[PDB]
Structure formats: structure tokens, C-alpha cells
Amino acid sequence: MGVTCVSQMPVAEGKSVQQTVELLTRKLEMLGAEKQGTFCVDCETYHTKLMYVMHNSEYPLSCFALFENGPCLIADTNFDVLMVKLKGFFQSAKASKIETRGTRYQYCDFLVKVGTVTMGPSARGISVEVEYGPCVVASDCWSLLLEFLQSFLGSHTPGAPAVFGNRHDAVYGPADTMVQYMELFNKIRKQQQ
Amino acid sequence: MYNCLHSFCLSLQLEVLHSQTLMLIRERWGDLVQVERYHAGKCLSLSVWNQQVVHKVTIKIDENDVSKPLQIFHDPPLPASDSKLVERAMKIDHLSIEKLLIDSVHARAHQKLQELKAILRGFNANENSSIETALPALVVPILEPCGNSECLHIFVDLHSGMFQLMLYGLDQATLDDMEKSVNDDMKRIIPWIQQLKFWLGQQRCKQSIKHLPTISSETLQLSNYSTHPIGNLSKNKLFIKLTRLPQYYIVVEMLEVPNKPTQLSYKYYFMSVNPAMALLLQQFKEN
Amino acid sequence: QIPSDLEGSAYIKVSIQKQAPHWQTKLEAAQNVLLCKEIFAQLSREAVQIKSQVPHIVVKNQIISQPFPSLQLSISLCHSSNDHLYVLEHNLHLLIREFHKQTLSSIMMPHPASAPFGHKRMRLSGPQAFDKNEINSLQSSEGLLEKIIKQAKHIFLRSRAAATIDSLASRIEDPQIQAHWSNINDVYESSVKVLITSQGYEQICKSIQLQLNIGVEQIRVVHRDGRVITLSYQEQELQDFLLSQMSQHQVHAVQQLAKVMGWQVLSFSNHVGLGPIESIGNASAIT
Amino acid sequence: INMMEYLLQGSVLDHSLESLIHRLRGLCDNMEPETFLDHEMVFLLKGQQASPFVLRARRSMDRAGAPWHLRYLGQPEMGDKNRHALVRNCVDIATSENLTDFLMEMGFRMDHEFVAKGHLFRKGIMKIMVYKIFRILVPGNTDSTEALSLSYLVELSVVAPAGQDMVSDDMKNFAEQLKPLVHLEKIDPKR
Amino acid sequence: NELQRKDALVQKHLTKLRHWQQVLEDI
Amino acid sequence: RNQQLRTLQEECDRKLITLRDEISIDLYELEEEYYSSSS
Amino acid sequence: NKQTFNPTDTNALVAAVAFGKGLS
Amino acid sequence: LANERLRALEDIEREIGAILQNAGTVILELSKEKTNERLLDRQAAAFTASVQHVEAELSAQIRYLTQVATGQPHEGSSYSSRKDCQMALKRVDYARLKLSDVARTCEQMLEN
């Protein structure tokens, strides 16, 4: 449960999504980040209100059920089986499977995951996720994340997701990352083009 | 009387050795040794260093010459003669099959270490590597004045026959890559040893400057780099930034001395820095 | 009536060398023999089959390992059938006892009646979402041999560090050197506090104090003034380190003495850079 | 894959209970008893179908930090594959503690709550639970409760993969090791 | 004085050791 | 039997821990004396 | 000879845990 | 544990009492004159009471054994606690030997 920040890297106005991904991972290989594996994020929507089922690679035994403004469930992987057991009350709502695939770089307690958002065959955007391991309280280490994002994003540097905006000493949780991913995926689905 | 009680005792010894091999296969070895043939009272034949991860040791009582004890044949090697080891690999007066297996495989591991030492002296006459025999090990030094560490230790795991390498401060990935390449073929040890010179050199620099106030690095990502003489240096360098005063770098370039293959030559430059730019470079005097 | 194969007395014997009510007694002795056979079967199987750094030799009832290059560890099951370190034998018994009790644990019980079965933190991994590292840390069966060899490595390294500190306290009398080992150890960690004070001025000169964290193959040094240096397992490194620290103490004593006697400290350089090159470390200077 | 639950069920009057427990401490594994105390609540989803979906949620009140538990139990298989045990399809899910609130969003409504307090033993794969079912009145409160009957309930359960025979026979033998004290049998859920 | 101080320390330590041997013998 | 053996184990461990603390204090005194010896 | 289990209690309890008979 | 076993011991003694009461009754009947015929009736009632309550105790214990028999070999044990207690005692013994050695070196130092 370290503080994370998820953002959309824009298209760059030219070239492929793969070339901009090559640019970002090249900058990361400059700064001293090392590859430590790959990562995948899956999101599907289920309807009778909409519910989302999401899977991270980082929490491989967990599945997250996101009710868009309601509460989040975290459960083990057998939750997927329950949806197959539901199957009449909650239809699968196909042509809305969405994934991000990429490599995860670690640079001194910073985890940077740069993925290509792929609705079916076509890749339609770049997701960038930066997790800061040690900090556990949102909006306190935010300036650290801002300097790291200003170091390698440069321009298009995001600012302050609304999960931070609940201004307390609230401990950040793993549900907030999947909330940010769900907001990003909805923005990319509405972006479409 | 001698024929009856000698034949019975020798086949009893073969039965004891077969039961011991089934104990070893069941308990501790397990597919590192396999029984090829067993004819009760006639012959036993075991297979070590198998093809899956080939070699054989056979014990035969001859159907003639009741005077002699049990006969041992190492039929795939017919191993090369090292006078102490092949002696011990040719007696089962002790009724331990594991001692026989270990002594035969020990002699083969000694032959494999000696062909490695032959490869190293083929690349470098006046080597100073050494074979230790308690475990079968080859200690090869990478830089010529060296400690007991900073030496590549090579072992042969004499239950599988592979090579296993050991340096002290190496990362595990490069050690796995070296082990895989050497266990593929011996003659690729010599490209690695040269690569292990420069790495070791950086260790001997980074231990040096640990008490002074510095930050060492192997890569310095500044601009220019293709016009400034700092681009026109070797790829084995070390950038030592002074931290009490930044914009000041001491650059160590490591080069191979041509005749001596186990020595390095250092060159110290003094860079200054402002998208960081190089500014100037001077080389210090040798002595 | 005890089974044969369980009579007599047996015990594990662990050694480090630099080299190449009547029925109650019977049943306790036979149970002890059974547990020693269990221990040695576990150890010998892990020696033969598990790939490890610097591999071992298992002959019949004896395991020989070389944890450090000058060191030889030997584990032997002495079965009587009618130099020894007790600590490792006792820890062997407790390790195999914990390895048994892991299967029969109350952590496998699911308090929710509906909940199936299995470990507790593996259940907590689902809702309280765990990373890769916590998941792998929960499920990592490290064998007995790795644990015992790490314990013996720490014992030998700690004894060498104590020996070098006491040899410097015996030989050198010019500053002084003290040590205070901690009360509490682990099986893989100890700690000292090394002072270096002059003889009659223990209030003035309290500026060089160290703390060494003797791990398994590393000695990690934390200075008083925020310098962290990781040495290696050799005993020349610690000797040269403490020699350089005595040399810096001989200058910090004069600085804090000129503080007392009212003299004015014109110049002070902790590692001076002019003059002859010193072999061990840098030289210090005041005026 | 899809795991199946094999059940045998029975009951035991409380004044003989201790002998049962002593018998179980002989036969089950070398353990102390567990003394679980759980709150179970049943949600249902009144869909279009004649059969509404059912879900069971358990919070282990006694142990702090125990994850909530969801259980979906399929309808029993009428096939005579395992003739001697209730063979059902079981989907069991560990969950966070906002579950009820989440289930309120999914369309689920509560049916009944009950506490269950008892002991827990195991034998290999088998799980023996001997518990008393406590009716909750004053539905929010978990303290206002009354015992449902004098008898404790005894369940012998094995959760394991689909099909997978020679399971119900071992449960038959373990039930027959208790047969003077308890009568365990495959009781159908109808009436 | 160093000699006399060393002997005083070892005597106190020896009395504590003998007391602890008498304690540990009684288990 | 289990409860009796647990009580014996706990008595042995309390004795050992108190022994370790007293020996540690003596070791501290001896270390100060030996290292600060003039010789 | 003495009865250790009442089977009507068995049916009542399994009807109480199989569905809501007796709880609500 | 001592309860049912002491019941078995009492039934042993009462079997002896049954045989002795048989013998005493025919002892009194063999007498030339047996004046205490009331005592003969008392010994007869003693004999029959002994046989009857021996039957009662043994029938009750066979019933109780029928209630708690299982035919299964009781997989419980107490081995691990004995093992840990033995390790604790050997720790204490090791510390005793080492304290003897330290005290012996202290005696060698103070001895001169």
C-alpha cells in the first residue's frame, strides 16, 4: 500500500504508441531504472448500475470489484468463478475488456509501470503509473512524486488525483490505485477515436 | 570347498551392493544414478552423469579364475591414469557402493579440472592457477597480485558433473550466465576472464574510495560525449564525483597492459561539468 | 522389543576444521536414534539434490562442505551400535522440530467454519492485497543445510572478528582499542562497539567509535560521523580498517586536546593529500 | 476448477457432547480443539428466475483480522456418482470487510442471521465441526441471542475437486467410527 | 593497583559463578 | 504430561535467561578492565 | 442404552442451517 | 483413571470374598452342631450379595466399555513436549559445564 499516481501519457501528436513507449522506457533506462519483470492490468465491466472487475499483476491472488462511486471489494481469484456462476443476473458485457501490458522498472523505491492500453487488438493510449513504496499517507509524499514525474515526464506532468483530494491523514490503500485505473480506462474508452 | 564358499560369498557381496544402490536411488541420489543391468550373481552395472542432465561403472565376477575378487570396469571413460585416484577407483574391498561411485566420479572431475587448467595455460603460459583436491576445485586468479578471495573458484559438483563458479562480489545473474556458458563449452572461459578483469578493477576502485567523501558510478550521462575527449576514451571507466564540491569528477580509465594478461593499467583524468556538459580534461602524471 | 536398526546410540557431530525407568531409557534412546536418522536423511538429500553454492560431498555418513575457502565444515552421524560444536547440533534438532511442527500447526485451521483450509497469511493475501515479495516470503522452504551453513559461517566470521580485535588490543598499545559485544545475538547477526581512546584521556578523545554488524559473509561498519562501510569476510580488511582508524584517532586526540589547553587550531585535514603515499589509508594532519 | 463439497450431517445432545469431543480428540489429528465463534448471514438476490441466488457471509467474531468469507453452494447433484454424501458445488471466497455494503449494492438483501459457536477438528482432508446454532433476535445486535435447540450439530465435510472418487468411502468409515455416539448420514435438503 | 583491582574483579566474578552453579544444579 | 513438561521447560528457560544477564554484566566489567589495562 | 442424539433435533437443526426455518 | 481401576481392584477382592463366603457357609454346615443358624443365614445372604454385586459391577463396566470403544488406535501423543523439555535440560547442562570451565580458569588465575 504505497502511494501511487496513475496518468495518461498523450499520443505525442506523431509516430506509434510503441515509439512513445520506447521513448519513455529509454528515458527510464537513462535515469537508472532496472527492469524487474512485466505487468498486466485487466478490467471488465459487468451490468444487470455498472460494476468493474479488475486484476493487477502486483497482487496476483487478488481481484478487485469496483462499484464506480460505491465501495470496493478485494477478494481472492475465485471471485471470477462466481461471476461465471452468476451469468444470468450479471451479464459479461463483452467488447469492453481492457488491458495494459508493459515492463515494470524499479529505481530506488520508485516503481514505474508504462503500459499500452489495448482494447481488443488496437492499442489506444499510454498508461503511466508511479508508485512510491515507503510513504503510506497520500498528499504528504506528493511533492516527491511530482519531482520524479517532472524529472522524466517533463511536460504532461499530472497533478493530484482526487483519491488524494480527500484531505485527511487517511492511509492510502490498494483500492485507490484500481480506482485511478478505472477512471483512466473510462477516459480512454470515451477518448476512443 | 573354496569354489562353493567363494562363489556364494561373492554373489552375496553383489547382492549387498545392489541393495545399497536401491537405497541410494530411493533415499538421497534419485536419477543421478541408475541401474543399467543386474544379473543376480553375475554382474551389476550402474550409470552416473547421465545424458538427461552416459558414464558407467560395472562390477563383474568372471566365469573363470576363482582366485581373484570382484572386478570393476569403468567402461565409458577407461579413465586416464592419475596414480592415487584410479587406485581407489578400482577396489570394492570396502562394501560401500557410494565410495566407489564417488571415487570414480572424483577421478573424472579431476580430469575435467585438468583439461580446464590446460585451456588456461593454452591462453596464458605462466598461469598461477591451482588445483585443490579436498574438494575438486580450481582457483584461477584474475588480477595477478590477489588475495584468497578475488579469485574465480571453479568446482565440479560430483553428483552431476557440471561446473559451478564462485566469485565473491558478483551478481547472481552474471554468475548464472558464466556457469551456463562454461558448462556448455570450456573454451568460452577465456572471453569471460577478460570481462572479469575490468569488473574486478572497479571493485578495487570502489573499495578504495569508500572512506573519502565521494560518489562513484560507472555511467555518467552528460551531453557532448562525441566531441569532448571524454567520448574518445575506453568503455571501462569509473566516474568518481566529489560531493563536497560537485562539478568535479575524477575519471578512472582501465586499460589492458599488452604483455601481462593479469595486470591492469589505470589512467586518471580530471573532468569538470556544468543536459550536463563536459568542460575540460587533464591526465595526471604516472609517477 | 525395540526394532533392530534402532538399537545403540546415535548422535550428529558437527565440526569445523582447517583441513582437507528400565524401558524408559531404551525407548528414549531408540527414539533419539530415529530422529538422528531423520535429520541426516534430510541433510544428505539436500546436499545431493539441491543445487547450492560451493557444493558438498556425502560419502556414507559424513557431509563435508567448504563454506569459506580456508574453512571445512563436517556433519557426521555417529551411530555407536552397541572440537565438536554443540550449538549447531542443538539447532539442527530444533530446525527439524520446527519443520515437523509446520505441518501440524494451528495456523492451517480456518476459524470461519465455511473457510476451506491452509495457512492464515495465505488467506490474508487475498483481501489484504500482497505483493510478489510477501507472497514469496510466506512460501520459501529453505533447507536445513543452507541454514546450518549460514550459522556456521556467522560463527566463524564472528570468531575471526573477535580475534583480530583482540590481536590489535594485544599488539598495539599506542592509542588503545576497546570492544563491547552486545547481549543479544541472532543466529545470523552480532554486534560490537569499538572505541579507540588514548590511555589517560578518555573524556577528551571520544570521537572515533564504531559499530560493526557481523552478518553471515559481511561486516557492516557504521562510524560515529555517518560513514557506512561494508567490509568482506577476510581478516585483512578489518585489520587495515582499524589501523587507519587508529591513525585518525592520533590526530583527533590532538585537536580535542588543543581545544582544552587553549591552543588555536589553525589547520585540520582529515585525509591529507600532499607528501608520500601511504599504503593502508590516507594520512591526517593538523597544525 | 470447480470444487465440490461432500457433506455428512447429524446432531448430538449436549449432555453426551464431551464424550464425543473426547472421541474426536482420539481420532482426529494431534491438536487441541479450536473453539470457533462465527456470525453467519444469508443474502439472496431476487432475480427473474424462480430460484433466487443465495450467498452466505461469515465474519469470525472471535478472531480479529480474520478475512470475511463468502460461500456459494450449488444445488446438490442428483447423479448417484457419490451415493453417500451430499455432493454440491462450492465456491469459497475470502473477502474484505465492506462486503455487506458491497452486497447491498449488488441487489442482495438479508434473510437471517445466526451465530454458530463450537469446536473444530480435522483428519487429513476431513473437517469435523461440532457447533451450536444461536438465533439472533434484535437483528443488529450480536449479543441478544437464544439457543435454537438442545442438540449440537455435527458436520463432516470435505471440500475437494470435481468428481474425485474414493472420498465418500473414507467419510463413511470415519462416520462409522462414531456410530454409537452420532448417526451421520446424507440428509437431503428438501423438507 | 592494577593487579589488586584485577584480583578483586575476578574474586567477585568467581563467587557469582559458584552461586550460579549451585542454582543451575538444582533443576 | 504436556502441562508438566511445559512448566519444566519454562523454569529452565527463565534460569538460563537470568544467568545470561548476570554473566553479561560481569563480562562488561571484565572487558573494561582488560581493554583499559596498561601493560 | 441411553440416547445420545435426538433425530428430530437433527432434522430441525439441518432445516435451520439449510434454509431459514426457525431463524426468522 | 484411578477410579475405574480401583473399581476393578475392589471386584478382585470381592471375588475372593465370594469364594471365602462359599467356604465359610459349607464350613458351618459341616459342623456336628451348628447353633448359629442365624449366622448361617447371614453368611448365605453375604455370599449371594457378593455374587450379585460382582455381577452388577462387571456388567456395568462392560456396558461403559461398550459406550467408549472405537477399535481405532488413538493417534494422540505427547512426544513434542518431551523433546522440547529434553532440549531445555541439555541447554542447562551445557551451561553448567561451561561455568565449571570458567570457574576453573578463574581459580588458576587467582591461585598464583
Side-chain angles (χ1 to χ4, degrees):
Chain A
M1 43 172 74
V3 168
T4 79
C5 170
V6 187
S7 86
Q8 172 143 29
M9 180 63 198
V11 174
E13 110 86 16
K15 310 166 181 179
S16 73
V17 171
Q18 313 190 23
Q19 297 188 3
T20 66
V21 158
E22 282 145 46
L23 283 172
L24 291 192
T25 53
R26 206 187 326 282
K27 276 200 210 177
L28 283 185
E29 273 144 350
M30 309 303 306
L31 298 189
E34 277 66 69
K35 339 194 172 173
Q36 278 185 37
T38 175
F39 84 110
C40 165
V41 179
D42 298 318
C43 168
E44 320 162 18
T45 182
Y46 290 91
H47 70 305
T48 79
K49 275 180 175 178
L50 283 170
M51 193 184 75
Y52 299 98
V53 178
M54 314 183 76
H55 323 266
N56 272 324
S57 81
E58 303 179 321
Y59 318 103
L61 306 182
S62 303
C63 302
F64 302 89
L66 271 302
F67 223 89
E68 190 141 359
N69 284 38
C72 187
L73 254 197
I74 317 163
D76 51 295
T77 57
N78 293 333
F79 198 90
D80 313 328
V81 178
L82 194 139
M83 302 317 290
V84 191
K85 291 296 171 66
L86 270 194
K87 203 178 185 183
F89 315 94
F90 276 79
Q91 322 163 31
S92 189
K94 211 70 61 178
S96 168
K97 283 198 189 172
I98 183 56
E99 313 184 11
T100 60
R101 293 292 182 96
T103 53
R104 38 169 288 173
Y105 291 99
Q106 176 157 41
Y107 166 58
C108 190
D109 318 321
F110 281 96
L111 266 183
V112 193
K113 307 213 277 303
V114 175
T116 74
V117 197
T118 164
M119 198 176 327
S122 85
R124 306 137 81 81
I126 297 101
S127 84
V128 162
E129 191 271 303
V130 172
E131 172 169 4
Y132 186 50
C135 294
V136 196
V137 48
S139 86
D140 294 30
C141 87
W142 163 244
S143 43
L144 287 183
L145 288 182
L146 205 51
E147 281 151 282
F148 186 49
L149 286 169
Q150 270 187 351
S151 70
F152 91 106
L153 252 74
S155 158
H156 322 290
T157 310
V163 282
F164 296 173
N166 304 321
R167 271 189 184 176
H168 328 267
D169 282 357
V171 159
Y172 194 90
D176 306 340
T177 308
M178 310 314 286
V179 160
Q180 292 172 53
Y181 266 69
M182 173 254 282
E183 294 175 4
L184 172 68
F185 281 149
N186 284 0
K187 254 185 192 160
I188 289 162
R189 264 198 298 250
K190 288 174 186 162
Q191 169 273 331
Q192 53 200 345
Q193 302 326 300
Chain B
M1 173 215 62
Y2 188 81
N3 283 120
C4 183
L5 301 145
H6 190 90
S7 43
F8 168 67
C9 273
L10 286 194
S11 169
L12 180 65
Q13 290 180 358
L14 271 183
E15 280 267 5
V16 162
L17 293 201
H18 187 80
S19 59
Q20 285 182 20
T21 48
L22 296 178
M23 289 310 285
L24 297 201
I25 288 184
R26 174 203 320 156
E27 289 174 329
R28 58 172 70 163
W29 288 67
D31 203 67
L32 304 181
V33 61
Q34 307 152 313
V35 176
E36 293 273 312
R37 278 89 55 84
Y38 171 53
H39 302 284
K42 160 72 182 173
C43 81
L44 175 56
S45 80
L46 301 154
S47 65
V48 299
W49 282 6
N50 303 326
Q51 181 54 45
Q52 34 91 29
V53 299
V54 175
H55 301 252
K56 287 180 187 172
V57 167
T58 63
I59 305 159
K60 285 226 174 196
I61 174 173
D62 193 305
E63 319 307 309
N64 181 284
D65 193 19
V66 77
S67 191
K68 59 173 183 55
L70 279 180
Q71 307 290 90
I72 317 174
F73 306 127
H74 316 269
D75 46 316
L78 292 174
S81 299
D82 193 341
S83 67
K84 180 46 68 176
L85 264 48
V86 183
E87 272 168 43
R88 287 204 257 101
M90 281 298 256
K91 45 172 57 50
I92 48 174
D93 43 359
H94 62 281
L95 275 193
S96 156
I97 195 57
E98 203 165 8
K99 278 190 67 205
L100 179 80
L101 287 177
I102 271 179
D103 290 11
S104 44
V105 171
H106 186 199
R108 284 194 284 277
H110 209 89
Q111 271 157 43
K112 200 184 278 215
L113 286 193
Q114 260 159 25
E115 61 84 19
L116 250 187
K117 182 168 182 92
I119 292 305
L120 301 182
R121 268 192 288 105
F123 154 73
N124 186 28
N126 188 353
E127 204 75 62
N128 286 70
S129 47
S130 78
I131 285 171
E132 303 178 8
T133 173
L135 306 182
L138 188 46
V139 182
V140 45
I142 312 177
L143 295 184
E144 187 208 12
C146 65
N148 175 225
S149 89
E150 314 177 352
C151 299
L152 187 62
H153 295 258
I154 310 187
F155 311 96
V156 185
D157 47 350
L158 48 87
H159 308 284
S160 163
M162 300 306 187
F163 283 113
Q164 283 183 1
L165 315 165
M166 178 179 142
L167 259 175
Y168 177 65
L170 261 180
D171 50 352
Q172 198 59 38
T174 59
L175 258 188
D176 296 320
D177 199 76
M178 282 199 50
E179 279 182 3
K180 196 259 170 186
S181 166
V182 167
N183 274 325
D184 175 41
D185 47 327
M186 265 56 65
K187 311 173 202 183
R188 275 200 289 182
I189 189 56
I190 312 162
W192 274 111
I193 276 178
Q194 286 138 3
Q195 267 190 55
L196 292 192
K197 276 201 287 190
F198 298 136
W199 173 84
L200 193 62
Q202 308 204 46
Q203 292 310 119
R204 278 180 167 181
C205 291
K206 282 176 168 172
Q207 294 168 10
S208 299
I209 321 296
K210 210 53 169 173
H211 51 270
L212 311 160
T214 48
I215 293 161
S216 54
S217 154
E218 314 192 347
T219 178
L220 177 74
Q221 290 159 12
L222 80 168
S223 89
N224 310 357
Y225 177 79
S226 43
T227 59
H228 212 272
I230 194 54
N232 318 308
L233 294 197
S234 162
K235 42 177 191 58
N236 309 306
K237 37 180 171 295
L238 185 81
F239 299 88
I240 304 182
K241 180 204 209 194
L242 308 180
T243 83
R244 278 161 181 181
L245 294 174
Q247 309 171 351
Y248 293 101
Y249 284 93
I250 292 174
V251 177
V252 184
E253 175 170 356
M254 294 150 305
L255 302 175
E256 276 168 341
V257 50
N259 259 337
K260 308 302 200 163
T262 47
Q263 298 185 11
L264 278 182
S265 53
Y266 296 92
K267 277 193 168 196
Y268 312 99
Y269 298 99
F270 180 83
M271 192 198 327
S272 155
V273 153
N274 293 323
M277 312 162 46
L279 288 176
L280 69 156
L281 288 170
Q282 283 82 9
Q283 181 169 177
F284 300 99
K285 195 198 180 307
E286 175 272 332
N287 278 318
Chain C
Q1 276 319 292
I2 303 168
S4 169
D5 110 328
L6 285 182
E7 74 274 27
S9 44
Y11 78 109
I12 311 285
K13 168 181 174 307
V14 182
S15 158
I16 275 176
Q17 54 209 12
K18 306 205 71 157
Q19 197 264 324
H22 160 55
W23 31 264
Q24 182 65 255
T25 299
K26 278 200 193 174
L27 293 179
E28 279 170 308
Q31 195 176 19
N32 178 41
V33 165
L34 194 57
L35 183 137
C36 296
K37 293 197 172 211
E38 216 283 336
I39 287 175
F40 198 81
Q42 194 69 231
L43 290 173
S44 84
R45 171 154 62 248
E46 289 164 11
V48 168
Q49 279 169 349
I50 291 299
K51 171 207 186 313
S52 157
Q53 182 182 3
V54 54
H56 329 285
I57 289 179
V58 184
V59 192
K60 42 169 83 165
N61 265 15
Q62 191 156 5
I63 304 177
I64 292 166
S65 290
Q66 186 178 1
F68 287 157
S70 88
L71 193 75
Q72 184 165 284
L73 178 68
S74 68
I75 308 178
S76 43
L77 166 68
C78 292
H79 203 303
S80 287
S81 50
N82 290 322
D83 50 348
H84 168 53
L85 317 176
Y86 176 64
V87 189
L88 298 180
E89 163 187 338
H90 170 273
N91 286 357
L92 269 171
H93 284 241
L94 292 188
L95 275 168
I96 208 61
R97 187 68 259 166
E98 293 179 350
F99 171 70
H100 302 329
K101 289 198 282 191
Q102 273 185 14
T103 81
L104 209 69
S105 47
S106 65
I107 318 179
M108 307 308 189
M109 304 297 90
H111 285 106
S114 283
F117 260 138
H119 200 264
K120 265 172 183 183
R121 258 83 48 84
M122 282 320 286
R123 295 204 196 92
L124 270 175
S125 83
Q128 179 187 155
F130 282 169
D131 306 0
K132 287 180 182 171
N133 299 20
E134 291 151 346
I135 281 175
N136 294 314
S137 73
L138 290 171
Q139 292 174 352
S140 278
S141 315
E142 194 73 22
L144 293 196
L145 255 181
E146 288 88 357
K147 297 200 183 112
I148 288 297
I149 288 167
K150 284 199 307 191
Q151 293 189 23
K153 271 152 84 181
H154 177 230
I155 287 184
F156 178 70
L157 180 62
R158 164 178 85 204
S159 91
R160 288 293 95 197
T164 61
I165 292 164
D166 289 11
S167 58
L168 284 182
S170 66
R171 285 173 38 223
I172 302 294
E173 277 298 325
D174 193 2
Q176 265 180 359
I177 176 167
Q178 305 191 28
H180 292 294
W181 293 85
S182 159
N183 298 335
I184 297 189
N185 317 306
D186 206 0
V187 298
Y188 322 121
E189 197 150 356
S190 311
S191 303
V192 307
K193 291 193 188 306
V194 182
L195 280 85
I196 294 147
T197 69
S198 295
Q199 154 71 52
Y201 300 94
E202 298 97 297
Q203 299 286 322
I204 292 175
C205 61
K206 254 188 178 172
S207 76
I208 288 190
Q209 315 188 202
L210 302 148
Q211 167 154 43
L212 323 180
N213 287 108
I214 310 174
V216 173
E217 70 269 30
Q218 281 193 342
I219 303 180
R220 187 151 191 270
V221 184
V222 174
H223 208 94
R224 184 208 181 89
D225 55 18
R227 290 188 296 158
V228 184
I229 294 96
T230 65
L231 313 172
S232 84
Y233 67 95
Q234 315 181 38
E235 58 185 348
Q236 210 53 51
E237 295 277 337
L238 186 55
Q239 171 141 359
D240 301 356
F241 186 72
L242 297 189
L243 277 184
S244 81
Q245 295 332 104
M246 294 179 158
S247 186
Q248 302 191 5
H249 169 75
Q250 293 280 302
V251 161
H252 287 221
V254 192
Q255 166 178 68
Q256 277 154 5
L257 164 71
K259 205 177 280 179
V260 167
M261 309 208 53
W263 284 49
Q264 163 61 264
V265 181
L266 294 154
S267 158
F268 168 77
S269 315
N270 206 355
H271 40 60
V272 83
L274 305 186
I277 304 189
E278 299 278 296
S279 52
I280 297 159
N282 274 292
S284 317
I286 67 169
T287 174
Chain D
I1 61 142
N2 45 0
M3 294 199 197
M4 304 286 176
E5 162 146 28
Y6 306 102
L7 262 176
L8 288 180
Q9 288 178 281
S11 74
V12 160
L13 297 155
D14 48 351
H15 55 248
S16 44
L17 166 133
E18 48 88 17
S19 86
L20 188 51
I21 282 179
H22 279 238
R23 176 87 68 89
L24 285 185
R25 278 213 286 157
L27 305 187
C28 292
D29 282 5
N30 194 17
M31 286 299 296
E32 62 277 349
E34 290 295 319
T35 73
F36 73 100
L37 174 56
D38 283 355
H39 176 115
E40 207 299 327
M41 44 202 295
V42 173
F43 297 95
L44 86 169
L45 172 71
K46 290 187 173 173
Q48 307 174 355
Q49 307 182 340
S51 45
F53 208 90
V54 72
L55 276 189
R56 295 180 180 271
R58 299 185 82 116
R59 169 169 53 95
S60 194
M61 6 192 45
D62 51 347
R63 317 303 172 185
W68 281 56
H69 198 249
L70 256 178
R71 229 190 185 192
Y72 168 63
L73 273 165
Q75 292 177 357
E77 321 202 315
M78 284 316 161
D80 210 49
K81 184 263 175 199
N82 265 317
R83 322 164 168 177
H84 269 88
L86 263 173
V87 186
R88 293 195 296 217
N89 210 356
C90 46
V91 178
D92 44 357
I93 283 156
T95 46
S96 176
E97 70 204 327
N98 44 56
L99 174 141
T100 50
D101 302 335
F102 183 78
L103 279 190
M104 292 302 292
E105 264 169 1
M106 277 197 56
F108 284 72
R109 301 161 198 189
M110 213 194 65
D111 277 328
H112 39 273
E113 322 185 346
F114 66 102
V115 196
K117 168 175 180 194
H119 316 258
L120 192 49
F121 313 96
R122 72 153 192 167
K123 173 80 168 310
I125 319 168
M126 295 147 178
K127 176 167 58 180
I128 301 291
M129 43 180 71
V130 180
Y131 55 96
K132 203 151 192 140
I133 294 180
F134 277 31
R135 178 197 289 108
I136 285 295
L137 73 159
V138 186
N141 177 242
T142 84
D143 306 73
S144 158
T145 184
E146 61 180 0
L148 192 137
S149 167
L150 300 175
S151 188
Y152 282 70
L153 204 154
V154 165
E155 269 179 346
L156 158 53
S157 161
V158 166
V159 52
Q164 196 81 13
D165 255 345
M166 83 218 87
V167 160
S168 178
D169 305 357
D170 302 336
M171 291 174 69
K172 275 184 259 190
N173 305 333
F174 198 83
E176 278 182 0
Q177 281 172 7
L178 308 184
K179 225 174 195 169
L181 262 173
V182 200
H183 192 262
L184 299 180
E185 78 276 8
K186 177 186 80 181
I187 180 162
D188 281 20
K190 58 179 69 64
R191 82 274 177 276
Chain E
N1 306 350
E2 281 209 26
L3 284 172
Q4 298 177 356
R5 173 147 41 70
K6 277 165 208 291
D7 302 4
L9 253 185
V10 176
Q11 267 213 324
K12 294 177 52 184
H13 183 224
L14 178 60
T15 54
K16 201 178 304 314
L17 291 193
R18 281 173 176 152
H19 161 242
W20 271 106
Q21 269 188 308
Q22 274 155 34
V23 171
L24 282 183
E25 199 269 329
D26 293 333
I27 304 303
Chain F
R1 179 80 265 174
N2 273 345
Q3 186 260 324
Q4 182 184 338
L5 291 172
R6 278 174 193 146
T7 47
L8 190 44
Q9 167 184 349
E10 282 322 291
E11 168 182 28
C12 292
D13 294 18
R14 282 192 293 104
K15 293 314 165 190
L16 266 178
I17 278 176
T18 52
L19 174 75
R20 152 169 83 82
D21 277 16
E22 296 208 358
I23 283 181
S24 177
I25 297 176
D26 298 351
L27 177 70
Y28 197 73
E29 297 161 348
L30 296 199
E31 281 181 349
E32 267 155 345
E33 180 47 59
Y34 167 68
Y35 283 139
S36 65
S37 91
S38 83
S39 166
Chain G
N1 203 27
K2 64 160 303 304
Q3 196 81 350
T4 76
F5 65 100
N6 177 33
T8 78
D9 271 321
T10 308
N11 300 334
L13 276 162
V14 76
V17 73
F19 50 91
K21 183 169 196 321
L23 291 172
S24 64
Chain H
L1 301 90
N3 38 15
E4 302 266 339
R5 191 213 176 195
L6 267 167
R7 289 166 192 174
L9 291 172
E10 286 148 0
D11 305 354
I12 288 182
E13 291 176 351
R14 296 305 174 160
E15 284 150 347
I16 308 191
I19 294 289
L20 197 142
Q21 276 160 355
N22 282 271
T25 309
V26 293
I27 276 291
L28 189 55
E29 287 181 352
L30 78 94
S31 174
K32 319 290 305 161
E33 166 65 15
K34 30 179 185 195
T35 296
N36 48 5
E37 320 176 11
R38 323 187 183 197
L39 177 139
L40 198 136
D41 264 8
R42 289 185 183 91
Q43 288 221 24
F47 149 78
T48 321
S50 58
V51 164
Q52 279 176 2
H53 80 82
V54 155
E55 207 283 315
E57 290 148 338
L58 259 76
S59 46
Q61 269 154 33
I62 295 176
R63 284 157 181 187
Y64 163 63
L65 278 189
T66 309
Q67 268 148 36
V68 296
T70 183
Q72 291 311 298
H74 197 276
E75 320 166 23
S77 174
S78 82
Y79 286 166
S80 71
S81 317
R82 183 214 314 256
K83 175 70 185 165
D84 291 6
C85 186
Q86 280 172 17
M87 299 323 286
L89 291 170
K90 198 70 210 298
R91 290 191 221 112
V92 166
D93 287 7
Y94 180 85
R96 283 212 311 115
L97 299 196
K98 292 288 178 285
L99 284 181
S100 71
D101 298 2
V102 185
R104 180 194 323 118
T105 57
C106 290
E107 285 145 358
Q108 292 158 69
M109 167 177 178
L110 285 163
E111 203 262 2
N112 293 319

